[PDB]
Amino acid sequence: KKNSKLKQDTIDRLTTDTYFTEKEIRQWHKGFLKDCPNGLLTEQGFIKIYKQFFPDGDPSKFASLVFRVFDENNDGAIEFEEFIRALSITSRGNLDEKLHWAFRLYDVDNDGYITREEMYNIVDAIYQMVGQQPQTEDENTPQKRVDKIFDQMDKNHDDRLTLEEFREGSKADPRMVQALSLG
Ligand SMILES: O=C(CC(c1ccccc1)c1ccccc1)Nc1nc2ccccc2s1
Ligand SMILES: [Ca+2]
Ligand SMILES: [Ca+2]
Ligand SMILES: [Ca+2]
Ligand code: NA
Known part of the structure; x- marks a missing residue:
């Protein structure tokens, strides 16, 4: 599928805009596909990940807010490029x-x-x-x-x-x- 493969054009833009090297981006894509074989993370799939990490409470409301920021083009899914851009800012941004x-x-x-x-x-x-x-x-x-x-x-x-x-x-x-x- 389009969404499942990592295209060189995507890597070029990501290395231009983010704090990640090509090597790191390719590593992260392997991990992204293991959790998301389609290459597209849905809102409920996003909520499910947050439930893996806060089993006591209900992360649904917070996860939905964060999802909207990740989904920068507002098409209802987090693609790999949007995932990396958000991770770059939140983990390595100034x-x-x-x-x-x-x-x-x-x-x-x-x-x-x-x-x-x-x-x-x-x-x-x-x-x-x-x-x-x-x-x-x-x-x-x-x-x-x-x-x-x-x-x-x-x-x-x-x-x-x-x-x-x-x-x-x-x-x-x-x-x-x-x-x-x-x-
Ligand atoms: O939501 C994620 C992304 C995701 C992830 C998956 C794989 C590898 C690294 C990260 C994840 C991380 C932790 C729990 C659930 C999902 N990170 C962020 N959390 C916050 C919270 C507050 C403000 C900004 C941010 S950016
Ligand atoms: Ca406002
Ligand atoms: Ca004011
Ligand atoms: Ca999107
Ligand atoms: Na958005």
């Missing part, structure tokens, strides 16, 4: 590259801004995956602590974060990106 990737995750509706509700949505997704925790203080909930972090980053108090607000906000308070292991 701080600015990782913070932009985090911004794309938090900006669920892709409108150029993070809202409070979008920030809640990611945070809730993480707790579902990792283990929800009870709060007996209505003034010390995740939603409220997130509000404080958000307010500190929202320099012009318009109730939304630009990429610049989020990136310079995260370099003084990296907690929203360390929650994704991208600090």
